[PDB]
Design an enzyme around this catalytic site. Structure first.
Site, mmCIF file in Angstrom:
data_model
loop_
_atom_site.group_PDB
_atom_site.id
_atom_site.type_symbol
_atom_site.label_atom_id
_atom_site.label_comp_id
_atom_site.label_asym_id
_atom_site.label_seq_id
_atom_site.Cartn_x
_atom_site.Cartn_y
_atom_site.Cartn_z
ATOM 1 N N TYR A 124 6.077 -46.923 5.562
ATOM 2 C CA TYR A 124 6.551 -45.575 5.788
ATOM 3 C C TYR A 124 5.564 -44.516 5.360
ATOM 4 O O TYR A 124 5.489 -43.495 6.035
ATOM 5 C CB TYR A 124 7.973 -45.357 5.243
ATOM 6 N N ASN B 260 2.892 -37.921 6.430
ATOM 7 C CA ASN B 260 2.566 -38.999 5.495
ATOM 8 C C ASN B 260 2.727 -40.452 6.021
ATOM 9 O O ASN B 260 2.524 -41.397 5.262
ATOM 10 C CB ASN B 260 3.336 -38.771 4.176
ATOM 11 N N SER C 54 12.544 -31.800 8.811
ATOM 12 C CA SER C 54 11.622 -32.384 7.864
ATOM 13 C C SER C 54 10.553 -31.409 7.406
ATOM 14 O O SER C 54 10.278 -30.405 8.082
ATOM 15 C CB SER C 54 10.983 -33.632 8.477
ATOM 16 N N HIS D 289 16.870 -37.348 7.695
ATOM 17 C CA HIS D 289 16.181 -36.353 8.540
ATOM 18 C C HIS D 289 16.256 -36.195 10.067
ATOM 19 O O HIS D 289 15.882 -35.110 10.573
ATOM 20 C CB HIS D 289 14.685 -36.438 8.205
ATOM 21 N N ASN E 240 4.179 -32.829 0.389
ATOM 22 C CA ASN E 240 4.647 -33.411 -0.836
ATOM 23 C C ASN E 240 3.547 -33.945 -1.746
ATOM 24 O O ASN E 240 3.656 -35.006 -2.304
ATOM 25 C CB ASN E 240 5.693 -34.460 -0.528
HETATM 26 C C1 LIG Z 1 14.748 -40.087 -0.101
HETATM 27 C C2 LIG Z 1 13.647 -39.313 0.602
HETATM 28 O O1 LIG Z 1 12.902 -38.649 -0.099
HETATM 29 N N1 LIG Z 1 13.543 -39.395 1.942
HETATM 30 C C3 LIG Z 1 12.637 -38.776 2.805
HETATM 31 C C4 LIG Z 1 12.640 -39.242 4.142
HETATM 32 C C5 LIG Z 1 11.750 -38.778 5.117
HETATM 33 C C6 LIG Z 1 10.824 -37.794 4.806
HETATM 34 C C7 LIG Z 1 10.783 -37.287 3.501
HETATM 35 C C8 LIG Z 1 9.802 -36.214 3.175
HETATM 36 O O2 LIG Z 1 8.621 -36.273 3.969
HETATM 37 P P1 LIG Z 1 7.445 -37.309 3.628
HETATM 38 O O3 LIG Z 1 7.895 -38.788 3.651
HETATM 39 O O4 LIG Z 1 6.727 -36.890 2.390
HETATM 40 O O5 LIG Z 1 6.393 -37.096 4.842
HETATM 41 C C9 LIG Z 1 5.974 -35.772 5.153
HETATM 42 C C10 LIG Z 1 6.355 -35.501 6.587
HETATM 43 O O6 LIG Z 1 5.623 -36.452 7.389
HETATM 44 C C11 LIG Z 1 6.469 -36.776 8.507
HETATM 45 N N2 LIG Z 1 6.553 -38.227 8.520
HETATM 46 C C12 LIG Z 1 6.444 -38.944 7.364
HETATM 47 C C13 LIG Z 1 6.471 -40.319 7.398
HETATM 48 C C14 LIG Z 1 6.566 -40.971 8.637
HETATM 49 N N3 LIG Z 1 6.578 -42.330 8.657
HETATM 50 N N4 LIG Z 1 6.645 -40.236 9.795
HETATM 51 C C15 LIG Z 1 6.635 -38.899 9.774
HETATM 52 O O7 LIG Z 1 6.748 -38.291 10.843
HETATM 53 C C16 LIG Z 1 7.781 -36.034 8.410
HETATM 54 O O8 LIG Z 1 7.717 -34.911 9.298
HETATM 55 C C17 LIG Z 1 7.838 -35.652 6.942
HETATM 56 O O9 LIG Z 1 8.615 -34.453 6.742
HETATM 57 P P2 LIG Z 1 10.562 -34.592 3.551
HETATM 58 O O10 LIG Z 1 10.403 -34.412 5.073
HETATM 59 O O11 LIG Z 1 9.804 -33.597 2.682
HETATM 60 O O12 LIG Z 1 12.045 -34.603 3.236
HETATM 61 C C18 LIG Z 1 11.666 -37.771 2.501
#
Ligand SMILES: CC(=O)Nc1cccc([C@@H](OP(=O)(O)OC[C@H]2O[C@@H](n3ccc(N)nc3=O)[C@H](O)[C@@H]2O)P(=O)(O)O)c1
Ligand SMILES: *[C@@H]1O[C@H](CO)[C@@H](O[C@@H]2O[C@H](CO)[C@@H](O[C@@H]3O[C@H](CO)[C@@H](O)[C@H](O)[C@@H]3O)[C@H](O)[C@H]2NC(C)=O)[C@H](O)[C@H]1NC(C)=O
Ligand SMILES: *[C@@H]1O[C@H](CO[C@@H]2O[C@@H](C)[C@@H](O)[C@@H](O)[C@@H]2O)[C@@H](O[C@@H]2O[C@H](CO)[C@@H](O)[C@H](O)[C@H]2NC(C)=O)[C@H](O)[C@H]1NC(C)=O
Ligand SMILES: CC(=O)Nc1cccc([C@@H](OP(=O)(O)OC[C@H]2O[C@@H](n3ccc(N)nc3=O)[C@H](O)[C@@H]2O)P(=O)(O)O)c1
Ligand SMILES: *[C@@H]1O[C@H](CO)[C@@H](O[C@@H]2O[C@H](CO)[C@@H](O)[C@H](O)[C@H]2NC(C)=O)[C@H](O)[C@H]1NC(C)=O
Ligand SMILES: *[C@@H]1O[C@H](CO)[C@@H](O[C@@H]2O[C@H](CO)[C@@H](O)[C@H](O)[C@H]2NC(C)=O)[C@H](O)[C@H]1NC(C)=O
Ligand SMILES: *[C@@H]1O[C@H](CO)[C@@H](O[C@@H]2O[C@H](CO)[C@@H](O)[C@H](O)[C@H]2NC(C)=O)[C@H](O)[C@H]1NC(C)=O
Ligand SMILES: *[C@@H]1O[C@H](CO)[C@@H](O[C@@H]2O[C@H](CO)[C@@H](O)[C@H](O)[C@H]2NC(C)=O)[C@H](O)[C@H]1NC(C)=O
Ligand SMILES: *[C@@H]1O[C@H](CO)[C@@H](O)[C@H](O)[C@H]1NC(C)=O
Ligand SMILES: *[C@@H]1O[C@H](CO)[C@@H](O)[C@H](O)[C@H]1NC(C)=O
Lengths: 292, 292
Positions: free
Chosen positions: B248, B79, B212, B266, B102
């Site tokens: 982000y 994302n 992640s 993460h 997500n």
């Molecule tokens: C408070 C909170 O929800 N934090 C949080 C922080 C980082 C990632 C995420 C979630 O992922 P998202 O932001 O939805 O993005 C989906 C995936 O895309 C990747 N990603 C996202 C944004 C970014 N700037 N670089 C990336 O590499 C990463 O591998 C991530 O798991 P999660 O992982 O479900 O936990 C959530």
């Protein structure tokens, strides 16, 4: 001093019955709802809905739990601090049937409020406030034990008054389905009944945004009790006899200061005035002092 | 310039399969749980439980939805704001199978991220953030329409990673039961799989408390894809070339965007380093620049 007027009380019963079908309003039953039916909330904006699930319907009784039930002497126990030190426990427990409000505690207070419970009310948001949404094994176990202590009492659960009940109702429903048959507690689930209950009390010059749980209990009780004795109705910060400071609730810590704005959504003083008149007319016995 | 090394990728696939049974781990099935079984949470204290209800079990697939499935070119779309203005939409949509994370929006962003979706993940707390816990008719309708737009895609719902999923999961379950057969979406519900998935990645010198969603998708994809192309993986607040500020997320760009410790979740920088090594070894194609 006080003398029951049976005739006037039964005339009040009849008048309540003309405005509220108490037997029916007491609880939804399986055949009065459909799966997928959208419920609204009596005291929230109309936009809030709750869809009736299979599981919810499976927890409804087949017939009103008060159908063809009759109790001679009923106690309705409100939560006023006036009960603290009253020693009314024994006299409350002699009643044929005792109603309590909002899952009020009895353990540390039995001498004053009794240990007998035949119905207690239960807003589902109790799970959020006191049982941590049933998230852990210990929460689940604490709730289960509180239920077990009720034995065969009615747990009167109004899930359609406040929209804040919605998510926590699913947690409640799941718990009861998961534990089906393990507890003797009789579940009752009133629907949208405040419009009907308010009609009787509007005629008696009482029109709050919300009637109190206590007066709702009196209303129900009128249909099934031959004589109703009220305890713990006294929405004031001082003792009528001694004049000493009194807590709002009997379960409040000693010295807790009577809260003025706790009850700004209710009109407890107006309720109390009306019950007090009723006391004078012999309709019901309002207890305001220590018992023997 | 980037060239796939099929041989090394196939060796990676085989290694991942020796540590994780991906087909099984993909989803709980009806027969792999009992009604009344207590689930625990992979990333929360063991005290947190969730009781498997009849209704939950009824939403589980009979068989792993990815059993004996094989796709040539897969896109795994993270994302990152790096996708904004990339024009990677067309190239992502040419893939045989696209994974998204997500429940990421595509409608307003198709030029950059594509409109094709064969699987998207769904933390249940999405209902609380974006659909107001399904409290109103409008919320229910919005969620329904978002589901309908997925057509026959897989919605991959991890309800047993965080205890904070518990109460919203009941809301989600009730919605899906209520709407059974009205949507073509195929539900999948992974259980306690992070212990197994972590084992493969520990060997590669990557040990966060939490991997992640993006790298979890890579892991799944390895079993069912011949070649995996990554997009939107770039966990930095800045453009890689210009160093100017970058959101982000590609969809959460303009606006008073609340900035917290999102990074503390993460070890995304370490994941990204590892994926970048893998890109170099020809295992997968990590896209960090415009497609057209
Ligand atoms: C408070 C909170 O929800 N934090 C949080 C922080 C980082 C990632 C995420 C979630 O992922 P998202 O932001 O939805 O993005 C989906 C995936 O895309 C990747 N990603 C996202 C944004 C970014 N700037 N670089 C990336 O590499 C990463 O591998 C991530 O798991 P999660 O992982 O479900 O936990 C959530
Ligand atoms: C709570 O009790 C009230 C009454 O106090 C219930 O409303 C009443 O429901 C009955 C059905 O049991 C209605 O009877 C009907 O009379 C109409 C004439 O207007 C007739 O066309 C029908 O065939 C039927 O016989 C009655 O109208 C209705 N009264 C009011 C004031 O609405 C109410 O359903 C109860 N609610 C719950 C949730 O138990
Ligand atoms: C139902 O109760 C009435 C009232 O009982 C009295 O008041 C109650 C609040 C409680 O204090 C009771 O112990 C009192 O007796 C009963 O009517 C009385 O019956 C008694 C005993 O047989 C008789 O000697 C009294 O004079 C009656 N008193 C009055 C005011 O009528 C009635 O019998 C009860 N019926 C049943 C089946 O329980
Ligand atoms: C913030 C808040 O909860 N306010 C609030 C204010 C007044 C009453 C109540 C609730 O009642 P409780 O305090 O649990 O008390 C049970 C009943 O006892 C009565 N009561 C209570 C205290 C008191 N000092 N005198 C009384 O008469 C009243 O009839 C009331 O409904 P409710 O009614 O469910 O809404 C709640
Ligand atoms: C019990 O209450 C009733 C009703 O309020 C009383 O009956 C009334 O008595 C008064 C005497 O002034 C009459 O004006 C009313 O017309 C009567 N009304 C009815 C409907 O009967 C009764 O007196 C009370 N009983 C006792 C023993 O005090
Ligand atoms: C009202 O509730 C009480 C429980 O609080 C019931 O009283 C109990 O009845 C059982 C079964 O006979 C006895 O073994 C207990 O010792 C009684 N407990 C108390 C505290 O008195 C009572 O039967 C219920 N009454 C009804 C439903 O009319
Ligand atoms: C995820 O896959 C792993 C295998 O990679 C499964 O772990 C096995 O679980 C059984 C009993 O459930 C054990 O007796 C085996 O020893 C386990 N193998 C390993 C390597 O630990 C796991 O069950 C799968 N989990 C889910 C939820 O699908
Ligand atoms: C992956 O999902 C897409 C939808 O996002 C599927 O493509 C659709 O297939 C239908 C029916 O054959 C067509 O009418 C649509 O035009 C297609 N939409 C798009 C946006 O391409 C695709 O078939 C799925 N792929 C696999 C392998 O399941
Ligand atoms: C593919 O990867 C393997 C394993 O690291 C290596 O031996 C082989 O040389 C690679 N092929 C290339 C770079 O063409
Ligand atoms: C996999 O995709 C490439 C890229 O378009 C293609 O040339 C190759 O033939 C494909 N393999 C199949 C469909 O088996």
């Amino acid at each position: 001093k006080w003398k029951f007027n049976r005739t006037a009380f039964l005339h009040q019963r009849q008048e309540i019955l003309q405005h509220v079908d108490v037997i029916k309003n007491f609880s939804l039953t399986k055949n009065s709802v459909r799966i997928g039916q959208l419920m609204h909330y009596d005291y929230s904006s109309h936009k809030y809905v709750f869809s009736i699930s299979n599981n919810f319907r499976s927890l409804l009784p087949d017939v009103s739990p008060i159908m063809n039930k009759h109790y001679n002497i009923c106690a309705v126990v409100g939560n006023s601090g006036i009960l603290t030190g009253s020693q009314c426990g024994q006299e409350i427990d002699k009643s044929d049937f005792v109603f309590r409000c909002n899952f009020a505690p009895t353990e540390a207070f039995q001498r004053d409020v009794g240990r007998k419970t035949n119905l207690t009310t239960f807003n589902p948001s109790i799970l959020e406030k006191y049982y941590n949404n049933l998230l852990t094994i210990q929460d689940r176990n604490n709730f289960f034990l509180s239920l077990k202590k009720l034995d065969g009492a009615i747990l009167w659960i109004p899930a359609f008054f406040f929209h804040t009940s919605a998510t926590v109702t699913r947690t409640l429903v799941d718990f009861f389905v998961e534990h089906r048959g393990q507890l003797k507690v009789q579940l009752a689930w009133p629907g949208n009944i405040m419009q009907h209950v308010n009609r009787y009390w509007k005629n008696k010059h009482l029109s709050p945004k919300r009637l109190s749980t206590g007066i709702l209990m009196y209303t129900l009780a009128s249909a099934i009790c031959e004589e109703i004795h009220l305890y713990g109705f006294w929405p004031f910060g001082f003792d009528p006899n001694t004049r000493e400071d009194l807590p709002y609730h009997y379960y409040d810590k000693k010295g807790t200061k009577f809260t003025t704005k706790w009850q700004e959504s209710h009109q407890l003083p107006a309720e109390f005035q009306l019950l007090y008149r009723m006391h004078g007319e012999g309709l019901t016995k309002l207890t305001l002092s220590h018992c023997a």
